[PDB]
Structure 1
Amino acid sequence: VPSWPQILGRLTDNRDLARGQAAWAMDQIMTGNARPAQIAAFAVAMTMKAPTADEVGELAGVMLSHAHPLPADTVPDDAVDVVGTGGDGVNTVNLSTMAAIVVAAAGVPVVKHGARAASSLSGGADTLEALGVRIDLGPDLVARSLAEVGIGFCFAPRFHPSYRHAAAVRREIGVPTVFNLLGPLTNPARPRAGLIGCAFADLAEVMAGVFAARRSSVLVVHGDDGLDELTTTTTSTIWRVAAGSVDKLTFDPAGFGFARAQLDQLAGGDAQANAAAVRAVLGGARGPVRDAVVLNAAGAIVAHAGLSSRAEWLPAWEEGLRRASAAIDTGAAEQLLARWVRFGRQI
């Protein structure tokens, strides 16, 4: 007999939920059956209790059940995502989005989950829109984008319409909660690999556990400067997910010859400014922004490689860095973006 008093009482008593209770709660939320007060109580109570991977996996599972799927047999088994929680409070250029373009241009299929800004000046979806990319495509056309261009963009609101009730509560309360983890865990194309940024150092291991449960090949990353990306200003903590297990690592870009950057060198502006930064990087502009893009693209390619049990960490990184740099240098990334824009205008 599941109910809000039972579930919220258990959480406020600092107890983990019984199997299925988080799922019940999320389903009530997704079906419009939860009062805003109940949604907010649930999100906050779970956050302060400390969510488990089982619980977060249940929430993401329910979201994915209610999402619009892509058509059968349209997502390659090795497709990758590059996406983060956001909420790092830094307002950088759109590193995941730029990395995603480069990854696809290197020949790794990318189905990117994304959304507009929550607290920053310009989100991934905002910047793509400013570049002339269509962010408004449904399942069939995203599938066609992936096949024809090598990248698809799943705009979260378009694929998760039933999340509107939760999204409203999240905006109202402002404080980050367990809900802030869900975007990266609920790509509707269900790619099995990705580079997944987490702004909240204390919740990254839980995100990794969710991916581990799905047997995804993922690097969950938190820059030690607070970025929900692999950073160039310092080390990053990586929760490496492979073969159903999570391994905690610290990553230093200096190990691959990257010079240290300052965080203000990665600072972003409005959608137009960040669109300009994308163009500059894909056009061959050298500097800190390119370095961060290449590093993150490489990370995603490493995750992709980890779909094979044969993959080795250092060779994977060297290969990833080589491929990412080459995809920019040959013009492949610049061309792929142009083709992506042309594709959307030809619909």
Structure 2
Amino acid sequence: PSWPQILGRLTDNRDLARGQAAWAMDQIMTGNARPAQIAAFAVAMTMKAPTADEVGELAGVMLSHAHPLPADTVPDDAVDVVGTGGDGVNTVNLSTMAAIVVAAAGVPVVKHGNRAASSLSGGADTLEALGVRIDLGPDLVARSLAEVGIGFCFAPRFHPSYRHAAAVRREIGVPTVFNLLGPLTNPARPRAGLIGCAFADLAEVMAGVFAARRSSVLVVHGDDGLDELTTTTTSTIWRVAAGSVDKLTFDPAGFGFARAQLDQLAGGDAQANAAAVRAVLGGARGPVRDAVVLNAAGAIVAHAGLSSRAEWLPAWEEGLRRASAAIDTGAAEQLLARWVRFGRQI
């Protein structure tokens, strides 16, 4: 492949041929691209409708340059709970709340992430405000997992940057498709996940890449535009299991959830979010606790999906019950406290 060949295909409004997105992303990752080639490719790839073949290639290459966790340190049934973000709603850190609740229910959670992209407070900022050590290395993430039930892979720590990245990001000033692939590049490679996507067309595509990984994932988009399962309206779920994709509309009303408003699910900065967490984990009832329950239960359903004999409404009932129980028994609050102690004693 070559730059003019790939770049010309893109400016011609064609999809890339097999191997070209990978070759391109790998030239960038090994320090073989000029800033103009980098910016051109990334931008053109942010504008063209995504496909599963190109997206799998970009993510596959990125994931090959990531730092793995030590051998046999990720349980088979580990889950991620993570969104692309990019949904411009500035919500309350639903994912990180759900992740603690999932882990407190007993399902291993290995998440990655970073600081906010455009939100007031990203999951990582919010963890940090709660006292949680965001910057552990592959060894201590693996001990976190083993001794707390949850580990957090900080993105800058697990994914190398590339030559010219700071100049390019500065100069272009916008996120690109390079920034939307996180769900697909978790360094621990959990096989289960609740994956929220702000862009429906990217989500469906990402559901196909997961499907081929044999992962058990619910890829989710609020029909209100949330990158989470929403309590405001229905959501679209691309339920991935046994190598196939089952796209369906989901209404949490089928399980007794009251309709909320977007306003009620809104976040603030890292302290405001850190306090919203303590409230929910301490028992505060309301629209936020509900959205947390719902997405936690979703992740538990993705987890149930690792057995071929999972049934949907029973997985869900059991997920809602386990997520609510984790809050109400104090398990989630006790886990957060344990997570804070862990990092402090190194």
For normalisation by structure 2, the TM-score amounts to 0.97
Q: CA deviation at 1:178?
A: 2.4
CA distance in 2, matches of 1:212, 1:275: 34
* Segment drifting more, 21-30 vs 37-46: 37-46
Q: Quickly say closer, same or farther: Cα 1:133–1:22, change in 2 above 3 A.
A: same
CA distance in 1, matches of 2:188, 2:208: 20
Could you tell me which residue of structure 1 aligns to residue 233 of structure 2?
234
Secondary structure of the equivalent of 2:200?
A: coil
Q: CA deviation at 1:20?
A: 1.2
- Structure 1 vs Structure 2 CA RMSD: 1.4
Q: Quickly say closer, same or farther: Cα 1:248–1:261, change in 2 above 3 A.
A: same
Could you tell me which residue of structure 1 aligns to residue 103 of structure 2?
104
Alpha-carbon contact 1:232-1:259 (below 8 Å) kept: yes
* Segment drifting more, 64-73 vs 34-43: 34-43
Alpha-carbon contact 2:50-2:201 (below 8 Å) kept: no
Cα deviation code 1:214-233 (max 9, x no counterpart): 01000111101111000111
* Segment drifting more, 48-57 vs 152-161: 48-57
Aligned length: 346
* Segment drifting more, 157-166 vs 84-93: 157-166
Alpha-carbon contact 1:29-1:166 (below 8 Å) kept: no
Alpha-carbon contact 1:82-1:97 (below 8 Å) kept: yes
* Segment drifting more, 12-21 vs 72-81: 12-21
Q: CA deviation at 1:12?
A: 1.6
* Segment drifting more, 44-53 vs 187-196: 44-53
Alpha-carbon contact 2:49-2:201 (below 8 Å) kept: no
Cα deviation code 1:178-224 (max 9, x no counterpart): 22331111000000000001101221101111111101000111101
CA distance in 2, matches of 1:258, 1:180: 33
CA distance in 2, matches of 1:333, 1:154: 20
* Segment drifting more, 102-111 vs 155-164: 155-164
CA distance in 2, matches of 1:188, 1:205: 22
Q: Quickly say closer, same or farther: Cα 1:216–1:168, change in 2 above 3 A.
A: farther
Alpha-carbon contact 2:22-2:58 (below 8 Å) kept: yes
For normalisation by structure 1, the TM-score amounts to 0.97
Secondary structure of the equivalent of 2:247?
A: strand
Alpha-carbon contact 1:66-1:162 (below 8 Å) kept: no
Q: Quickly say closer, same or farther: Cα 1:218–1:117, change in 2 above 3 A.
A: same
Alpha-carbon contact 1:99-1:296 (below 8 Å) kept: yes
Could you tell me which residue of structure 2 aligns to residue 222 of structure 1?
221
Could you tell me which residue of structure 1 aligns to residue 142 of structure 2?
143
Q: Quickly say closer, same or farther: Cα 1:218–1:174, change in 2 above 3 A.
A: farther
Note the residue ranges of structure 1 that are not aligned, 5 or more in a row. none
Q: Quickly say closer, same or farther: Cα 1:307–1:67, change in 2 above 3 A.
A: same
CA distance in 2, matches of 1:176, 1:199: 14
Cα deviation code 1:307-328 (max 9, x no counterpart): 1110011101101000000000
Q: CA deviation at 1:34?
A: 1.9
Could you tell me which residue of structure 2 aligns to residue 72 of structure 1?
71
